[PDB]
């Protein structure tokens, strides 16, 4: 058993994953500088932990091209890592906040007719709370659209919106690996953006309903290791998004769940095909 | 038969596609301002002609989510529209220029050890020959990487390279729709970058080998309407890239082939 771990910087989660991988066999730490294709790689599975989502996607795809299975897969990283592709996959299967997508600012100006104000504008490929805007009226919508337009990263031309959900000072972050619920936390914040990368504080979540909803959300994709983001609302639990490069250090500490161990175990199972 | 056409501006392409669609049935011209999802669309098929590649990709996926088939599909638009994903799909099946991909500046610095100089650096998602660089030495490589580093787009951090191929003052552009070869042209230029978008001149290409190779290249994807780019080298024909939102106004003019008609005929086949 030779397990690759693909990384940018060795965070607490990567070190934990390295340690667990060592229990099952030989670990090969691949910094991004070590990644050159086509190339000769002697690996049974690669655990993809690149900080950049796009780098993770392309490294997954490239390892697959060499006949090397990858956790997560390029398909999952693509579909789960893009907010629009992901809600489309979730839309059948689990409750989600009301959303709208538009392809131009003219179309985007009609979104409040469906969703009303306030609404949330967010980029399709973002993480850690980047460029989220709470938009309360026409003036801010225009402002947000004007700014998205002059940024000239063409991904910002996909206009994705949700209704603003009234949360109770927190949201929920859940974890499902290979279909198994491994744990969940609340992330508290006095601002509507609750990320722990933005100062959110975590405590454990034992709500039986989120375990059930999390597994369903995972099943909408049917593979891999996913961090799941859930909102408590007036109309019950809502699945906001799904994250194919889970951070978990505070989650594992708070809950006592071995996220790194479960991720490695799932990777050895995919290695065994 | 009710056929949607999504567009940004009505190019010659889109006017011809609309006329041809009108011969089959009802046409619904959908500017990007008319695209709002989830929504209610009454359409049997949608022909995707948005100028932005990413807008084409997402509008295809969105119509798919409403149960409406799309030409091209979101899958094909992503796989063929990304140079790295596209060459990985091609490399099994057809000759391609030698290539290398790195995930960081440090890895990219090793690419000359495999490819040698000169090499070509190009972005993974580009079109019209934009941001192509012919890199003749290490100083040039470093300059390109430094500039890519300081650009916003995280996609510029996927470093894709090819050997520089000595072409005979032109390259070839081929069209395959539904597995059927529809036509080819030479694109001539005094510069190594031959795009008609940058002033390349079209001449008709009747070479039977480009027809054969083009069909094979299409078969690597197995669906849709593709514009295929082929290089002539001292090793023979090489497939460079594939393009899922084909421009054809000049190719059609020069060859007398009906790219718009074949496109539409394939879309209604796909609809039913």
């Amino acid at each position: 058993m030779r397990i690759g771990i693909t990384y940018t910087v060795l965070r607490r989660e990567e070190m934990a994953i390295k340690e667990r991988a060592g229990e099952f066999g030989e670990v090969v730490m691949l910094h991004e500088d070590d990644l050159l294709f086509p190339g000769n790689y002697d690996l049974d599975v690669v655990i993809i932990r690149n900080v950049s989502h796009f780098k993770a996607l392309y490294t997954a795809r490239l390892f697959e091209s060499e006949g090397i299975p990858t956790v997560n897969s390029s398909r999952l990283i693509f579909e789960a890592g893009d907010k629009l592709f992901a809600t489309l996959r979730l839309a059948g299967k689990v409750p989600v906040p009301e959303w709208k997508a538009a392809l131009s600012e003219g179309g985007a100006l009609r979104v409040p007719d469906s969703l009303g104000y306030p609404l949330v504008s967010k980029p399709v490929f973002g993480s850690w709370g980047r460029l989220l805007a709470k938009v309360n009226d026409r003036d801010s919508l225009e402002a947000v659209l004007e700014h998205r337009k002059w940024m000239k990263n063409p991904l910002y031309g996909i206009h994705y919106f949700q209704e603003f959900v009234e949360k109770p000072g927190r949201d929920i972050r859940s974890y499902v690996i290979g279909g198994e619920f491994v744990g969940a936390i609340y992330r508290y914040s006095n601002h509507w953006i609750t990320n722990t990368a933005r100062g959110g504080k975590a405590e454990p979540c034992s709500d039986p309903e989120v375990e059930e909803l999390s597994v369903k959300a995972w099943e909408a994709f049917g593979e891999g290791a996913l961090a799941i983001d859930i909102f408590e609302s007036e109309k019950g639990l809502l699945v906001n998004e799904v994250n194919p490069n889970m951070e978990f250090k505070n989650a594992a500490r708070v809950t006592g769940a071995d996220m790194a161990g479960k991720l490695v175990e799932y990777a050895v199972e995919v290695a065994k095909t | 038969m009710r056929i949607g056409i999504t567009y940004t501006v009505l190019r010659r392409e889109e006017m011809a596609i609309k006329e041809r669609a009108g011969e089959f049935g009802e046409v619904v011209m959908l500017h990007e301002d008319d695209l709002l999802f989830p929504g209610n669309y009454d359409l049997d098929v949608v022909i995707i002609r948005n100028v932005s590649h990413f807008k084409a990709l997402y509008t295809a996926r969105l119509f798919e989510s409403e149960g409406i088939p799309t030409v091209n599909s979101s899958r094909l638009i992503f796989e063929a529209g990304d140079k790295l994903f596209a060459t990985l799909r091609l490399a099994g099946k057809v000759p391609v220029p030698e290539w290398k991909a790195a995930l960081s500046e440090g890895g990219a610095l090793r690419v000359p050890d495999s490819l040698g100089y000169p090499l070509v650096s190009k972005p993974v998602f580009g079109s019209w020959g934009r941001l192509l660089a012919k890199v003749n030495d290490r100083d040039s490589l470093e300059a390109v990487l430094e500039h890519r580093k300081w650009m916003k787009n995280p996609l510029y951090g996927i470093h894709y390279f090819q050997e520089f191929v000595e072409k005979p003052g032109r390259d070839i552009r081929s069209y395959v729709i539904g597995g059927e070869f529809v036509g080819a042209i030479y694109r001539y230029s005094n510069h190594w970058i031959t795009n008609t978008a940058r002033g390349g001149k079209a001449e008709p290409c009747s070479d039977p080998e480009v027809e054969e190779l083009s069909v094979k290249a299409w078969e690597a994807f197995g669906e849709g309407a593709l514009a295929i780019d082929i290089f002539e080298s001292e090793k023979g024909l090489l497939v460079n890239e594939v393009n899922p939102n084909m421009e054809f106004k000049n190719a059609a003019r020069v060859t007398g082939a009906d790219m718009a008609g074949k496109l539409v005929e394939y879309a209604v086949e796909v609809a039913k």
Binding site: K152, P154 | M15, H53, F125, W128, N153, A197, E247
Partner: peptide, 30 residues
């Protein structure tokens, strides 16, 4: 038609007025 490019872009119908095509973005093309 409401977005034809002519030898640039037709922005309006009701009062017909031409206008220059928008900024070429980094994902424009084929």
């Amino acid at each position: 038609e409401l977005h034809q490019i002519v030898e640039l872009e037709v922005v309006s119908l009701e009062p017909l007025t031409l206008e220059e095509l928008p900024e070429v973005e980094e994902d424009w093309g084929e």
